[PDB]
């Protein structure tokens, strides 16, 4: 186990204060779908025509 | 029939009113299409090409909505009748050359406004009378308009004997004196003819026309003989070559602009207008307003024609369905 965390490298801070670092994302986005209806706002089902 | 446009024009005939989409089967069945709360209006209609649908009408944006009878785009016939006062002379003056002229206000084939005339010569001699001054006069001027040489007449000549009062008496370039042996001819109606019409090259139109008579001498004063007096039209002129070139020119609006310019690289368009068939026409002018900072008005225009057969049957049917659709008070035919 000493082996092991010793290869992981170490890094010195000033104090023990919560420390915090910013994350990096992505954009490309598609958008889901609630619902659709008619012309008369009448939902659509599944088992409905064209 | 190119024509002035509020940015659109689109044109769709209703060939057929049916009640719903799955009813459009021929070219021309149209269904007026609006949702139960009454805020768009669309038309479908079945296209040689499938059904298509029109423009949505935000049935706030309505500028106004009025049907014609196919009544208000015929065009009568202007026909006058021309006859010798009684004042100058009840009878031809021998000696006098008795010229006719008819005033035109545009060339044959052209449209700009100019003036063009046609002449008819008769010289009177001792004992020639009102009728046969008629006669000769007529012939003269189917022989010196009825000369066409390519397709026909630029007005129509005809004679009335007292006996008849009604029955108009053809004369043509060929007429001779020896086809017309009546004695009672009391005066010439010259009627306007309908020129050649081409579906999207020559639109329909007119030529008008004012008999004027030039000056003789009865007692040593110049003085003018006739009477060009309007009597009522006979004859009429339909609007299926007026509509049928409506059709062809907003058809571009939808369609493609391009129709015969590069003739074997085309794309030919199916109209569905028949020119020969009296359509009663309805137009509905909206407009699309827009959102913030875009309050500029797109306005715009769907209009519909259908065939009248008497009764405005079609339209009056196809409006009463855009009134049960769309809420609107369009009025009758």
């Known amino acids: ?50 | 029939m190119v024509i002035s446009i509020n940015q659109v024009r689109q044109l769709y005939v209703a060939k057929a009113l049916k009640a719903n989409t799955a009813a459009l089967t021929t070219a021309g069945d149209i269904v007026p299409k609006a949702d139960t709360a009454k805020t768009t209006l669309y038309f479908q209609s079945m296209s040689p090409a499938g059904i298509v649908a029109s423009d949505k009408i935000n049935l706030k944006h309505v500028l106004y909505a009025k049907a014609t009878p196919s009544e208000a785009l015929a065009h009568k016939l202007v026909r006058y009748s021309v006859t010798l006062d009684a004042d100058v002379s009840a009878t031809p003056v021998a000696g006098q050359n008795y010229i006719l002229r008819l005033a035109f206000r545009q060339y044959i084939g052209l449209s700009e406004e100019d003036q063009y005339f046609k002449y008819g010569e008769v010289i009177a001699r001792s004992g020639m009378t009102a009728s046969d001054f008629y006669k000769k006069m007529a012939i003269s001027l189917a022989k010196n308009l009825e000369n066409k040489t390519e397709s026909t007449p630029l007005v129509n000549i005809y004679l009335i004997s007292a006996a008849a009062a009604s029955t108009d008496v053809p004369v043509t370039s060929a007429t001779k004196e020896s086809d017309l042996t009546a004695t009672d001819y009391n005066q010439i109606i010259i009627e306007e003819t309908e020129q050649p019409w081409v579906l999207g090259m020559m639109p329909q139109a007119f030529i008008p026309f004012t008999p004027q008579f030039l000056t003789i001498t009865v007692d040593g004063e110049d003085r003018l003989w006739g009477v060009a007096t309007v009597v009522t039209p006979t004859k009429t002129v339909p609007d299926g070559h007026l509509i049928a070139d409506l059709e062809y020119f907003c058809m571009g609006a939808r369609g493609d602009i391009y129709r015969g310019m590069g003739y074997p690289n085309i794309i030919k368009t199916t109209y569905l207008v028949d020119p020969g068939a009296v359509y009663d026409v309805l137009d509905i002018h909206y407009f699309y307003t827009g959102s913030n900072e875009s309050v500029q008005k797109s306005e715009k225009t769907i209009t519909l024609v259908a065939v009248d057969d008497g009764s405005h049957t079609a339209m009056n049917a196809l409006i009463g369905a855009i009134n049960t659709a769309s809420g609107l008070t369009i009025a009758t035919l």
């Open chain 1, 1 to 50: 186990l000493d082996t092991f965390l010793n290869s992981f490298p170490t890094r010195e801070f000033e104090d023990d204060n919560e420390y915090y670092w910013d994350v990096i994302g992505s954009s490309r986005r598609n958008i889901p779908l609630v619902e659709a209806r008619d012309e008369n706002g009448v939902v659509v089902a599944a088992n409905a025509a064209n």
